[PDB]
Symmetry: C2
Subunit: 418 residues, 2 copies
Amino acid sequence: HMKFGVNYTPSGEWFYTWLNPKWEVIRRDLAQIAELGADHVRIFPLWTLLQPNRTWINPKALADVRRMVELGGEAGLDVYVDVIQGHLSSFDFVPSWLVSWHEGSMFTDQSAIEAQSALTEAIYGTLSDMKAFAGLTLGNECNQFTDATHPRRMPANAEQIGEWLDTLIGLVAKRCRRDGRLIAHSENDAIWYADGHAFLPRYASCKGDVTTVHSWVFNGTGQHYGPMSCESLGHAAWLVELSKAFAADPHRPVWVQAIGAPGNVIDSADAPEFCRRSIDAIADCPDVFGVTWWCSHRIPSAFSDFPFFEHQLGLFDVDGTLTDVGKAFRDAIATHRDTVAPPRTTAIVIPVDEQGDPLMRAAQAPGGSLFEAWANLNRQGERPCVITSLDAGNPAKLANRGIVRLERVELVAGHAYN
Amino acid sequence: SHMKFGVNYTPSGEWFYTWLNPKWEVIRRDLAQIAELGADHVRIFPLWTLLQPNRTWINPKALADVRRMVELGGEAGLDVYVDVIQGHLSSFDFVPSWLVSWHEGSMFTDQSAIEAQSALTEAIYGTLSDMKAFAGLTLGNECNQFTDATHPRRMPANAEQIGEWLDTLIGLVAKRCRRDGRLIAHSENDAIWYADGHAFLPRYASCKGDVTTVHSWVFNGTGQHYGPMSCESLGHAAWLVELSKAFAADPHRPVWVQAIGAPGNVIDSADAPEFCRRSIDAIADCPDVFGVTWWCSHRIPSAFSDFPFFEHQLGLFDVDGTLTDVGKAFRDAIATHRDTVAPPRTTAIVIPVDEQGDPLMRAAQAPGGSLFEAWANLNRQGERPCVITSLDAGNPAKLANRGIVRLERVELVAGHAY
């Protein structure tokens, strides 16, 4: 059955609380999350505090991560830790030894990679004795650093990205398997949607233990089709099913690791229903690892330079009370506690090259022919899945997935995306 | 008319990374060691990233840690000077997340950033204002390095905007400083004296704030072009003292040698004690010297990476806490010059300036330039030269106020050693 969790934004001080955590408030924060019926949280230490020198990891920062995990467990939550932030809510947190006079690419500078390796090992080893420590993600949407849009871009080609993922995941993959924990990585949706982007779809769907997707309908979907359109309400289920096309394993779990109802496209009055119906569509996709809502506690209004909608994403308001979206999410957990999605047997076909990479990612981005073909089949009640053209010509893969019907469409780029 | 003697305080063991979790018993021992030298003050350096992690939130714990370090300085018998904005330390930039990449801005021209720096200056002064040991503030360590074209993530500004930035931040506390008995200053690296085209102008250091600050580092081409133990190198700090007075409106304005060391990349380790003694000998023969503040107290531990190597040796106390040979020289220099009063300097070299009092050619007063060598040659000859501008040379009142009786002129010949 699906797991239900929340991305943990500390009340009152946000991630600025890591300098001097208020453990009694954090204990209360985590207790509130558990009261929703959530079974896990995802937490975010800051790279700048963890590793202020390339060869010195701050022991107090590690002990603070340990204490937050410990409090998560005492609240009855499994705790997932993102190692490298890196990036959170429009802000970059990059240690001084990788900035300006020391500027470097985290993806290709060998000394930086060895530092990220040491940090990954230090986080795992710090937490490894804890019953509540459930697994690690390399870091939140690290691919945003290498995208051509980034104003201080860290360069990398696709081969170097694959090596970066393999290096860091390979440090802990064996331990995670024998310990019963998970190792994953996380990209924003440029990996699915942006042609020329150095993170490739198959990286998300084949590397690490589960696929992560982050579903944000401010990516042009809500603006182009309407915030409460089938395209918008189904966007998270679309990412789940799209991602499986690029998976070698036919029942690999897909983790909707971040999803929210962004107020820059969805009116606040629609956000509870956006939450309920988005989770309804996700729950009708097989093999969903879980849904992790963004986020637990609203950002205090005294903090500046956030995009305004980021402040409202919290399930709990600044005074600690449960919002209407929080109620919807609580109710969605109860609704889908034991939901089992039936197999999906009609697949749309993604044309790919001989390496299994899309001929045109823009066609599966919002506004694209493949995006809309899936959305139309979904609106017609046909419950589509997604396959590549390579797999379409392999009956063993089709049989293992139960696919009996194939729908094909031409490649047409969308222009609604970002 | 007596010089103060102090040390720039680099915390033992953890360097400025100690601000994450200060080891107060070690810091107390650090400051007692500095006082044991006979030093009467320290200069301390909080980190901007920890003080102000959001544009509109200053972290109260970071403020309380600054207050506690000042308190321990006082308990050691030291006056404490605080640099507000780092900003820049020993090749590293510490710039908060809200002023980088997606949030990239210039601290010199972005009005909302200027208002944040104002709030931080006021918060630091106000936190420390009731403390007997708090002796004054500098806006920040060598902030001009952020606007130089050499900087790889330059914060733009023209010379007018730099003047406004200084006037704005200094103007916040200038009157309180005067009524309370404290000082306000600003600090630039030597590009202000040497770099043609630089938006910080010499008259800014010599007229704005209460005392002129200079940072004397003979790796700026002086040690290379003339030799590490040359007169040009041993006299370089006194040269900056006398050069700076040419651009001061106040004829007896104090000049603070706020940072000076014997950098191992140009000065042999065996020569550093004599470099310390004789540099201070030269400074002590310049009138109106506010004080000498050695860089730095405690050597950087070898476990920390990516520092220019010479930065590790600069400490008066070794990584094991024992007093180095330079520390002995500096201790002995304090005792030698406790009561040294420098006689007036009456022979002046003339700096040609435009109608605004700015050099016609800064390269001529940089290492290798005609004006640079004219002062050094007169000093080596025992002539104890001072420096005035061409505007001052044609003003009998200014000449009278400074006791200038003899003027030496040289044609402008640019240097290229800088």
